[PDB]
Amino acid sequence: DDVTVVYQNGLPVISVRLPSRRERCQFTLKPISDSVGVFLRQLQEEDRGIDRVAIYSPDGVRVAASTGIDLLLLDDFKLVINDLTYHVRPPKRDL
Helix, strand or coil: CCECCCCECCECECCECCCCCCCCECCECCCCCCEHHHHHHHHHCCCCCCCCEEEECCCCCECCCCCEHHHHCCCCEEEEECCEEEEECCCCCCC
């Protein structure tokens, strides 16, 4: 339960723990414009020691980058930071 998904002002907020400092860093994104590559590119740009960054679907399949993040916020998934295979369940939305 080390990574959150809690909405504020109609948009997702993803507070995750970084590898360098343990202070939780939240990530505000847009379901419309922001994509998975904006999120992971961001994450790489808040820790210089993040080596391989990934996101997988429940069935292990790597989710693409140009996929909209609104489409990622329909089901649960896995955010992978280094050896950390993270599991995330996002609250219910419509679209």
